[PDB]
Nucleic acid binder design. Sequence first.
RNA 1: AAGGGCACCACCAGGAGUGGAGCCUGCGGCUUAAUUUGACCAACACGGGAAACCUCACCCGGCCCGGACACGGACAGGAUUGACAGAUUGAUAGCUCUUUCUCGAUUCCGUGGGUGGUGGUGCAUGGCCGUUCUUAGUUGGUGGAGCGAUUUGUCUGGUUAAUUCCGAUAACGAACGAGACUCUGGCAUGCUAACUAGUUACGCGACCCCCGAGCGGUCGGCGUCCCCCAACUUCUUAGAGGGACAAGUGGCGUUCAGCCACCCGAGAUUGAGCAAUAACAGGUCUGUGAUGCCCUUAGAUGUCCGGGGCUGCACGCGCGCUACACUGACUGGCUCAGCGUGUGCCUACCCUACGCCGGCAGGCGCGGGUAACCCGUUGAACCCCAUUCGUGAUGGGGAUCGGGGAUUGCAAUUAUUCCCCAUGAACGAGGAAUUCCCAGUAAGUGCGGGUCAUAAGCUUGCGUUGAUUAAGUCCCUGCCCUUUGUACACACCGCC
Lengths: 55, 104, 67, 114, 98
Amino acid sequence: GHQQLYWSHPRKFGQGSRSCRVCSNRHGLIRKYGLNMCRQCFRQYAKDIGFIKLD
Amino acid sequence: AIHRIRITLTSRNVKSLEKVCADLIRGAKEKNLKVKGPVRMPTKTLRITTRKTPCGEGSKTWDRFQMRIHKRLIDLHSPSEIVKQITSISIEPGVEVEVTIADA
Amino acid sequence: YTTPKKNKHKRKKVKLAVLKYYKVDENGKISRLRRECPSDECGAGVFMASHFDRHYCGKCCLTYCFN
Amino acid sequence: MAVQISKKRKFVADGIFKAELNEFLTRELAEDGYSGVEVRVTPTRTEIIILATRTQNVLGEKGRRIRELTAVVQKRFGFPEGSVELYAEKVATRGLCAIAQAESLRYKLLGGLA
Amino acid sequence: MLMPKKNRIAIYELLFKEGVMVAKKDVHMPKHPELADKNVPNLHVMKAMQSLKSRGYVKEQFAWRHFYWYLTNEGIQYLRDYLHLPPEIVPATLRRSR
RNA sequence: AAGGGCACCACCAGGAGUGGAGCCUGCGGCUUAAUUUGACCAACACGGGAAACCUCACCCGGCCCGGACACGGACAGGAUUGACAGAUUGAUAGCUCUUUCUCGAUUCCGUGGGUGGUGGUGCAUGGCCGUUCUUAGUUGGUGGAGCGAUUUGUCUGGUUAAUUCCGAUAACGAACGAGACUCUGGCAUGCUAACUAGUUACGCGACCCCCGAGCGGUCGGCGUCCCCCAACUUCUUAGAGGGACAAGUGGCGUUCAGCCACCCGAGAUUGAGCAAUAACAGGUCUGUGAUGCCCUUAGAUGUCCGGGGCUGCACGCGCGCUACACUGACUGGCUCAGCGUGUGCCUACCCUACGCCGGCAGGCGCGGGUAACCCGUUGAACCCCAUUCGUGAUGGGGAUCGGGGAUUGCAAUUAUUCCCCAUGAACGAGGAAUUCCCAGUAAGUGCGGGUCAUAAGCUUGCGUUGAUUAAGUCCCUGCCCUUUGUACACACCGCC
Ligand SMILES: [Mg+2]
């Protein structure tokens, strides 16, 4: 409807307040170190960020 | 001016950190500024353990990713001014430099 | 599906003709037959509603009630 | 201090910037022989170097396209004005770059070669 | 899009001042960050640029969660005669110092 | 079927267990408007899936277009958009109705055509990942054999963790895998460096002894990078280097490849990561603005909002937690860690010292920390030392359940979590079965991270205490190589 109910439901917290910064997914996020990236997207881009495998 | 400055260098790789911490202090010796020795701070090991599969089906294998952050501190102390003397930085990509004074 | 309620009839506007709700007399003497919204955001240009028991400003959305 | 974030978050954010810029350049300069991106960051300013085979093609008419991409990377990450410079560099031995050869193979397959 | 003139011309002149414009994909974003004083919703600017794309005056590139619209030569003259401007003022990407 | 070799996802000798009880959690079933759904060694604390809203994909209702663009109607004499009052609605959704105002070309209607979809199809696909298989295996060129599928190379033997190597040799020369490699742990009183780590020494102090010690003892009390106003790196940190190679000795060996024992040594087998050819109709289209095709697209399978559900219970199963007690529980005192995190682009939500109030959960002010600077010398638990208990379903166990008080949130009922007082239920070591494991290991024990506005019985890591047994075998379950048989080749879950 109008502006009073279109987005009136609070999303200041919870799982619905956070989304993947790459694919806009809402499951398996990684908020550690302010990453804000999906679980799969982090595996996709870890070489680019610099998280490399040692052991 | 009477100045005493601190230069901290941080990055992900020891080779470039060591060569910067070497060439900067060698320039200081050739430019006769007495050098407070390079202090190697403990390494920051950013660890992220994540399930390998994008599905949740399998043998529950976990992939662990590491990021090593190394940082060094060099205090440049001279009886005369320091900043007007040293102006070149000679910094390659990858390493981040921060210069403060004794007040900060 | 098989919705219990019938299809909700969407509102259709009244299709008003030319407004012409103000009149002058004897070769021109102005007569506002509609109330004026006195706020700055309404301004002196727009006219208020003349509902049977209140007045409504189209822009200022002020409602003046007479009992 | 309070204004600057910690070193851990700062390095993670640098990696995020590198990854986002690389993905953007891959999706944009795909047909121009994109190979890679190298960022040299300094407190004074930053230099983004695009390693690509067709430099004369990534640079539009009188640098129109490189100016466009410079403005885009300006506005998306919000650098201070005039603090970012984008250069294009021709790669050496493009046969050794797997990115360029994979892109060329994709171009051929989209064209319709067997 | 029911978006009015008072923000349509604002978006169009932003798009003409520099040959590009960047918009984060957030239809629920209350305000597009630059042109902060025009009260232009992100949904309105996204759909205006989408209409321009459909008419072919701007080309669209999509990274993770952003649009990176690039104005085109077909968009040059359309912006010029929509904003009633003689062909002498150019976008930033076109001419610099020359 | 034979021969040789190997493996705690096999056994042996054992340990801790699970299966028995309660509870948590995940599947099936039942019920339901819905109890959304994938997956059946290699599914079942798995989808990082600890769901009040969101998540959400399910159900019950209600809004909006966020249906681009093109064409035709419609139109400033108005295409059309919002909204006060009453009903109406769950709703202060002008959602619809009565009512008139108001925006002005942005829209409306119709036709093509978009677009979106956690809609279908993983038996159309990509990528990733799991498994075959972490076993040691795999392939080309030229040459030889065969009419050819193919074969030799790629092997009698010895040896190895290993087609690892020595050797033979119709093969020669190679390639991948293994190894090599990277990280990690162990020694460096050797080097460099340290006011964001310290040590020693010295000086102020504070206390005990003062009989008399006095260069006596304690101090995580204050100082000596406050710049002249001590040195040094043993301890901590992290760099460059070294160090271990079956190197030395004895024995065995074709005296080769190597194996066993011993000396000296920190170490004579530290744990991981990476990991071949070929495959599976193994899993994901519910990760993606990865995606073909199909379906839907204005009364929506788009999207938003309210409520409910994903928890629902005659029952079965899986991963776990708590226990059944005296090798213990309670009460008090003493005393020791290491990983690692900490104030946010959106994004609001950080770790907390100290003081005060409260019995507790908590609350109120003052600060510190974007961090070897502050929490923090991380005063952790187990353990240790004393007290009470006394073989009882007992002071073991804390499920169930009542009342009350706080915290988070917009909201706590189907109890979010926490605190207090009551109730002490099964459970007295668990059938048939079955899992994991060889040294700082199992197990006991706590502490970090992820999830997190609130939070862990989960998971990923860390430290503390620290064993019994074994240095073997192919017996069971399997794996590799060679020979052999085959009526199998969807390949013994075969065929008949
Ligand atoms: Mg008691």
